[PDB]
Design an enzyme around this catalytic site. Structure first.
Site, short mmCIF file in Angstrom:
data_model
loop_
_atom_site.label_atom_id
_atom_site.label_comp_id
_atom_site.label_asym_id
_atom_site.label_seq_id
_atom_site.Cartn_x
_atom_site.Cartn_y
_atom_site.Cartn_z
N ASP A 1 0.96 -1.48 0.48
CA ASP A 1 0.13 0.29 0.24
C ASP A 1 1.33 1.20 0.07
O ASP A 1 0.38 2.20 1.20
CB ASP A 1 -0.95 -0.32 1.27
CG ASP A 1 -0.28 -0.14 2.50
OD1 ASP A 1 1.31 0.21 2.93
OD2 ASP A 1 -1.38 -0.36 3.35
N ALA A 2 2.02 1.29 -1.33
CA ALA A 2 2.57 2.70 -1.11
C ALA A 2 1.33 3.02 -2.72
O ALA A 2 0.61 2.29 -3.15
CB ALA A 2 3.97 1.93 -1.79
#
Ligand SMILES: [Zn+2]
Lengths: 150, 146, 228, 171, 200, 350, 65, 34, 104, 43
Positions: free
Chosen positions: F319-320
């Site tokens: 979850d970048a």
């Protein structure tokens, strides 16, 4: 007064409970593109949806894409709202895939991608906690009057 | 999931007759409580095993659960087939008031789909009664860290 | 088995939660003899063996009457005479009676009288009226509730949820060579010091292995030696 | 089908109803009798009722101990406060008719141990004999007016046959 | 929830019932029903000692002592044997009457420091029967305040008969959501009387 | 007690609205007990469920629902005169025997009447309440473990309204629902005529609330008005929550108050301490019936971009995010920081 | 639009919030304090008096904001 | 123990009687019984 | 259901208060106490078809409710006081107690 | 409102001996957010 541009570090969200920080900033050449040449804006990896079990973003992106080509805003409510099977009928008349699962070329080498892509407009709201007013450093500064400590 | 429902039906109606198997462990009115959680944990793992042999390859929740990257064979099963029964510290959602859980459910009716169990998938959707029973174990996931 | 299993071990706490002790039997089959030590080890309460208790007056007597059910002795296989009850009335110092006033009347019936800063005639026989049917007559006076169960073999064991340990080795139907337990710091009293070390070694790697992770054996033989 | 008309004939007469907590309705499927009222007592503005009663002689009386401490014999008084409420009308049923009377108050007569009290009033006094030397309002104001007022000896009688006539003549 | 009764279940120190009450004139008082070693008692923050209940309902006029077994327990149950220890504490002090039942309390109160220089020593228990259980008040009979103790006492016996009957204090019906405008008024009348007594 | 007031947070529009509906508890030193920390099932529609903070303040802060009225006390005197008309007895008359045999009315926890056969007593009183002779904020909670019924008039307790259903047919009357949209039949006249009534948490014991009109039984009362009114106004902006996981709702409701967008129409005039803006805001694509009632769409927060969910260049592992330099150069969300500073000219004694 | 009571029970939920808002709790509580309760305070502390000069008095008759 | 003394309903009491007889007789009420 | 387990009791006391009505027609100094609804916005005790008692005490006001409700483990007697004098006369003991309540 | 003292600060959470002697404060530090990068080596 000052303004600033969203460079990397800035905490973004997704409105379904996904914290997220900007990793890097690519140029437009490196980005992929569909058959019409539409370049996507934000990239996220598919590795969140099995763990976080966030089915809502997987069906909101379908509910969003069919509404744009029909020119109509769609209601997403709790315990109801617009369904799926009536929504797939709209964009298949427009000519896209029947569940938004499109395919698009690679911007860095040209050819097709071996798997298919999943695509659409999603609503990314910016949060607080920007990084320009959290970076600080104390090399050798003031000391406390009672402890001689930082 | 109806096979486990009518097996529960002959197991819940033994209150007027007064059946008690008396497992070792001094049951005293838990034989119609401690066994249904055993059979509800049978339908929760069986249906999750039907998907693995009946899903095609190149499937992304399959191909990252075949690895040890992230996920499991139970995480994908709650997304496509059934989410199971919420447990609360070793209890199958105890009653809220007047020997029941909700004002939507009849008096002293000791069936699953009324106390703890929710039968439909996250893809299908959640009913306003069963939405609350998921929103109790989700509270427990944040309390226990404290 | 979690964090509140580790905390009282490193505290060496006097009050341990759920002190079950392990005792292996002599026999392997029941033969009405695998549960006969469970009668010999459990705190036999007389209110289970008594049936009907009332105060009997002719004109000048103040004595409570107790009658037993001899079919209960046939039922749960315990072994005791009638006279050892009449012993155990005056063996309770909580009830303030004289040592030798007990008269036996027939087989099943048993009665005891009392007599004399005044009006204690009504009081003491009303105080003792409920304070008699709460005394032990046979069994270990420390433990709470023994539970017999079956292991994965045909051999069966007995689990006793009590604090007394030495008299468990003193009783019959059990060996004094394989009787493990919990609550390490009473094995320090009973079986020297070198048993209490190996008890600490055995407990932590049991209550950790059932959570999936395993650090090392060797990280615990340093913990046992630094405390002992 | 049939109707039984009822009319109210009651004014200017306030009748109180007594409740005996000790004395039950029946004794073994047989209705018992009311105890005979030896004497009566009423205190206006405080609304008490001290009905004196006789208890029987030698058989269950325990005479020798009773006269020793408190010196009060054969008199058992019981106190009840007259409490009013709305509704609650009394009625006698005529053949095919019924007339009504409004009930003023209802009392609940509780056993008032006076001889134990009077023996312990003097016990306060005789302890004071040997050494002999060396704004409020509300509910507690209602007690300082209840102990000191005029007592009226009510002539306990059995009557009401005149009162039975007085209700019928009123239309 | 102020001005209601709540039951509690405690493992090792016995079990207690609480009832807090606060009317708008100087009142902040909570009442306890403790069960020491099988005997029921009543302690309050104005009384220095604990008092068994068989006195305080005889102090309200209800003294016939077969009413008391029938109110607390009823009939044909195990409650009568549970209550059987409580009755003899009335017998030990030998009160047996409505007159003596008051001043037993007022001999063991350390309150009010003789604000009235003309004491009665029998009237100071009528007001001790007035500053207690402030849900209901009384004029002359002490009727409804008596049984309100007994209805409180019926709960605490049922608690010892089985521990399942005790309700928790986090049920939503036991919560009184108290707003802002009805809370700024509590500061206002406290501060408004601080105005004019400085003005006099 | 301290901290009874707080500065309202003007980060978002709904952040200033979500703090208007929140609850600060009493902290009764039950830190060992997980009872008050957990969530009770007697909360469905009483107050919100999916907006509760985490960390230190983990379960002692709660939030109101979408349909919620708070009761107020009226009087306890005339209803005591009203039950005597209904044929109830008085407290100073009954024996000790009858009170345990019969039931008993409780007025605010206190018995007064010792009623017998309560079902004729209670259902006539609903018919007295729905006609509107007695005020409507009264509850007839009636348990059966003990032998009693309860009367409550204390006020300041939770309640929500639901519509009355008599039998296997409801009291819906769609021609009244058409007469509402004409404009002369408001919501207050529904409870005046006898078509809606308020229920507290205690009356929801005796109720048997229905979900849908396709779920009506001839033993079924009090049809529920609208099932998605169980979420708060700061929780309502999640689109299709019933497919989404429940722990991923509190993570958003704690972040929804931290979203940047517009503030108010006079935002170029007010001088506040540290106040951010977004330059180019946009209303969301998938709206909600909730957000059009608070007019979130009239001044939104955040914008909707074109996502392509995929792995790319390894710079998004867990979850970048990855975005392009052009869209920022076209102006993708250029936020702006406004900050107050002040000083006071001060006069001295000389 | 053939209206029915099946899926158009929602259309009274705006009719609730329109006439009866979302800051019901803070409006209706404080507005009751202004009208009613302010009279109820001065009627509880009326008639200030002094012991010296006993024929002097001052009384609060009403309150307006 | 169903020890109700009628006309007062109060209690009964085991009294050490004459020659130690165990007659039952309550206080605050003139009543006696074997 | 269980809510129908008392309308038969509402029949089981109309036939059990009319029997007490009939035995006491001989006016033998018997009394019955019953409560009247005050706060009015004379009549006739009547029976309807198949065991149904009601009164009409007002000009319009109809009252259907009659139910003999208590258990009576005590004694009562009525006596009339008059002007605080030699006026203590005992009327008689009360056999039964019923209530009168309106319909809503 | 109770006044501080010598013993009132040597004990307690981070009064002395824990925030002044056991865990002090250092110079030459920083505290910023992080973002990943594959294209540089481990160490
Ligand atoms: Zn007696």
């Amino acid at each position: 007064r000052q303004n600033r541009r969203p460079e990397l570090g800035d905490k973004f969200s997704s409105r379904h409970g996904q914290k997220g920080v900007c990793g890097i900033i690519v140029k437009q050449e490196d980005m992929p593109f569909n058959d019409q040449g539409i370049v996507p804006d934000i990239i996220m990896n598919p590795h969140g949806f099995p763990s976080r079990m966030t089915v809502g973003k997987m069906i909101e992106l379908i509910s969003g894409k069919a509404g744009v080509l029909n020119g109509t805003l769609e209601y997403g409510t709790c315990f109801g709202g617009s369904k799926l099977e009536d929504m797939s009928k709209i964009l298949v008349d427009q000519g896209f895939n029947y569940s938004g699962k499109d395919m698009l070329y690679s911007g860095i080498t040209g050819e097709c991608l071996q798997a298919y892509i999943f695509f659409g407009p999603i609503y990314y709201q910016k949060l607080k906690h920007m990084v320009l007013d959290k970076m600080h450093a104390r090399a050798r500064g003031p000391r406390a009057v009672l402890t001689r400590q930082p | 999931v109806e096979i486990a429902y009518h097996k529960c039906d002959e197991l819940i109606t033994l209150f007027n007759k007064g059946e008690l198997e008396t497992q070792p462990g001094c049951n005293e009115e838990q034989t119609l409580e401690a066994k249904i959680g055993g059979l509800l944990s049978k339908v929760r793992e069986e249906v999750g095993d039907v998907c693995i042999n009946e899903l095609d390859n190149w499937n992304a929740p399959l191909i990252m659960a075949t690895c040890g990257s992230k996920g499991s064979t139970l995480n994908v099963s709650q997304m496509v087939a059934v989410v199971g029964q919420q447990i609360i510290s070793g209890n199958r959602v105890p009653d809220g008031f007047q020997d029941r859980s909700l004002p939507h459910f009849p008096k002293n009716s000791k069936t699953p789909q009324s106390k703890g169990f929710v039968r439909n998938s996250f893809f299908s959707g959640l009913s306003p009664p069963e939405f609350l029973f998921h929103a109790i174990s989700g509270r427990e996931g944040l309390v226990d860290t404290a | 088995l979690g964090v509140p299993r580790i905390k009282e071990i490193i505290n060496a706490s006097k009050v341990i939660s759920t002190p079950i002790i392990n005792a292996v039997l002599v026999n392997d089959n029941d033969e009405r003899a695998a549960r006969v030590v469970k009668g010999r080890v459990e705190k036999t309460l007389l209110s289970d063996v008594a049936f009907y208790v009332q105060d009997v007056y002719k004109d000048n007597l103040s004595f409570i009457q107790v009658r037993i059910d001899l079919g209960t002795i046939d039922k749960l296989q315990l072994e005791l005479t009638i006279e050892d009850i009449a012993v155990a009335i005056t063996r309770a110092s909580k009830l303030k009676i004289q040592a030798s006033d007990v008269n036996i009347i027939g087989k099943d019936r048993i009665a005891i009288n009392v007599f004399p800063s005044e009006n204690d005639v009504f009081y003491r026989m009303q105080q003792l009226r409920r304070a008699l049917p709460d005394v032990v007559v046979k069994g270990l006076p420390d433990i709470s509730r023994a539970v017999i169960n079956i292991r994965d073999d045909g051999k069966r064991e007995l689990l006793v949820e009590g604090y007394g340990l030495r008299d468990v080795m003193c009783t019959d139907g059990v060996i004094g060579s394989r009787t493990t337990t919990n609550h390490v710091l009473e094995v320090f009293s009973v079986l020297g010091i070198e048993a209490a070390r190996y008890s600490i070694i055995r407990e932590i790697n049991y209550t950790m292995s059932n959570h999936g992770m395993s650090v090392d054996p060797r990280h615990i033989q340093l913990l046992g030696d630094v405390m002992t | 089908i049939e109707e039984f008309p009822l009319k109210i004939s009651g004014e200017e007469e306030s009748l109180h109803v007594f409740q005996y907590a000790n004395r039950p309705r029946l004794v073994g499927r047989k209705p018992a009798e009311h105890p005979f009222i030896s004497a009566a007592r009423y205190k206006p503005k405080s609304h008490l009722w001290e009905i004196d009663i006789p208890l029987d002689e030698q058989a269950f009386y325990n005479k020798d101990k009773a006269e020793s401490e408190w010196n009060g014999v054969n008199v058992q008084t019981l106190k009840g406060v007259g409490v009013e409420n709305n509704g609650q009308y009394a009625a006698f049923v005529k053949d095919m008719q019924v007339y009504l009377v409004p009930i003023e108050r209802v009392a609940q007569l509780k056993p008032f141990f006076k001889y134990i009290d009077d023996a312990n009033v003097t016990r306060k006094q005789e302890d004071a004999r040997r050494p002999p030397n060396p704004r409020l309002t509300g509910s507690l104001l209602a007690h300082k007016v209840a102990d000191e007022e005029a007592n009226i000896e009510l002539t306990w009688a059995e009557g009401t046959f005149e009162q039975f006539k007085d209700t019928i003549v009123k239309e | 929830s102020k001005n209601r009764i709540i039951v509690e279940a405690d493992e090792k120190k016995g079990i207690v019932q609480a009832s807090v009450t606060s009317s708008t004139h100087e009142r902040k008082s909570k009442t306890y029903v403790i069960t020491k070693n099988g005997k029921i008692y009543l302690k309050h923050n104005s009384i220095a000692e604990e008092i068994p209940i068989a006195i305080v309902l005889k102090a309200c006029g209800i003294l016939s002592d077969l009413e008391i077994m029938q109110l607390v327990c009823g009939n044909d149950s195990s409650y009568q044997d549970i209550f059987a220890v409580n009755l003899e504490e009335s017998s030990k002090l030998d009160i047996y009457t409505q007159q003596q039942a008051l001043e037993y309390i007022g001999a063991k109160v350390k309150t009010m420091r003789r604000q009235k220089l003309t004491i009665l020593q029998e009237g100071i228990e009528a007001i001790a029967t007035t500053v207690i259980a402030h849900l209901t008040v009384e004029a002359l009979d002490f009727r409804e305040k008596a049984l309100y103790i007994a209805m409180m006492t019926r709960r605490v016996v049922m608690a010892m008969y089985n521990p399942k009957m005790i309700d928790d204090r986090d049920y939503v019906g036991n919560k009184r959501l108290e707003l802002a405008g009805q809370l700024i008024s509590l500061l206002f009348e406290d501060l408004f009387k601080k105005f004019n007594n400085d003005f006099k | 007690r301290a901290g009874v007031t707080h500065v309202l947070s003007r980060l978002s529009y709904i952040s200033a609205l979500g703090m208007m509906t929140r609850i600060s508890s009493q902290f009764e030193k039950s830190r060992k007990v997980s009872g008050p920390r957990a969530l009770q099932p007697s909360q469905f529609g009483m107050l919100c469920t999916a907006d509760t903070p985490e960390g230190e303040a983990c379960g002692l802060v709660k939030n109101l629902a979408l349909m919620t009225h708070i009761t107020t006390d009226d009087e306890e005197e005339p209803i005591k005169k009203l039950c005597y008309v209904l044929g109830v007895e008085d407290i100073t008359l009954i024996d000790s025997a009858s009170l345990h045999l019969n039931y008993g009315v409780y007025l605010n926890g206190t018995l007064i009447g010792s009623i017998r056969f309560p079902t004729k007593f209670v259902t006539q009183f609903r018919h007295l309440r729905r006609t509107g002779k007695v005020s409507e904020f009264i509850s007839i909670y009636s348990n059966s473990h003990q032998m009693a019924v309860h009367i409550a008039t204390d006020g300041g307790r939770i309640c929500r309204p639901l519509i009355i259903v008599s039998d296997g047919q409801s009291r819906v009357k769609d021609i009244h629902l058409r007469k509402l949209l004409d404009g002369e039949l408001d919501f207050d006249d529904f409870l005046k005529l006898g078509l809606v009534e308020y229920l507290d948490v205690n009356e929801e014991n005796d109720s048997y609330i229905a979900l849908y009109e396709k779920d009506i039984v001839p033993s079924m009362t009090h049809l529920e008005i609208e099932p998605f009114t169980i979420l708060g106004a700061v929780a309502g902006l999640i689109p299709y929550p019933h497919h989404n996981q429940s722990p991923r709702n509190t993570y958003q409701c704690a972040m929804g108050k931290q979203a940047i967008g517009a503030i108010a129409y006079n935002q170029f005039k007010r001088i506040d301490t540290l106040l951010y803006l977004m330059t180019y805001p946009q209303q969301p694509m998938v709206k909600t019936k909730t957000i059009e009632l608070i007019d979130y769409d009239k001044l939104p927060a955040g914008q909707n971009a074109t996502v392509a969910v995929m792995s790319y260049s390894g710079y998004d592992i867990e979850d970048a995010l990855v975005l392009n330099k052009s869209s920022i150069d076209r102006g993708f969300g250029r936020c702006e920081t406004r900050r107050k500073t002040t000083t006071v000219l001060k006069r001295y004694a000389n | 639009d053939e209206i029915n009571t099946a899926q158009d029970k929602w259309h009274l939920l705006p009719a609730f919030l329109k006439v009866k808002g979302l800051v019901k709790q803070h409006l209706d509580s404080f507005n009751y304090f202004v009208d009613t309760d302010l009279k109820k305070i001065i009627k509880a502390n009326q008639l200030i008096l002094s012991d010296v000069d006993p024929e002097f008095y001052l009384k609060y008759v009403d309150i307006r904001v | 123990m169903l020890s109700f003394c009628p006309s007062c309903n109060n209690m009964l009491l085991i009294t050490s009687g004459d020659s130690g007889v165990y007659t039952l007789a309550c206080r605050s009420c003139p009543y006696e019984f074997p | 259901k269980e809510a129908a387990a008392e309308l038969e009791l509402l029949n089981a006391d109309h036939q059990h208060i009319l029997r007490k009505l009939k035995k006491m027609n001989n006016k033998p100094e018997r009394f019955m106490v019953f409560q009247l609804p005050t706060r009015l916005p004379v009549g006739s005790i009547r029976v309807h078809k198949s065991g149904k008692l009601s009164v009409k005490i007002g000009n319009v006001v109809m009252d259907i409710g009659k139910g003999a409700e208590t258990t009576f483990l005590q004694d009562v007697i009525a006596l009339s006081i008059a002007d605080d004098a030699s006026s203590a006369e005992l009327l008689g003991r009360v056999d039964g107690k019923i209530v009168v309540t309106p319909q809503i | 409102k109770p006044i501080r003292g010598f013993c009132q600060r040597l004990k307690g959470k981070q009064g002395r001996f824990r925030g002044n002697l056991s865990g002090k404060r250092v110079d030459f530090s920083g505290r910023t957010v992080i973002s990943p990068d594959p294209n540089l080596s481990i160490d």
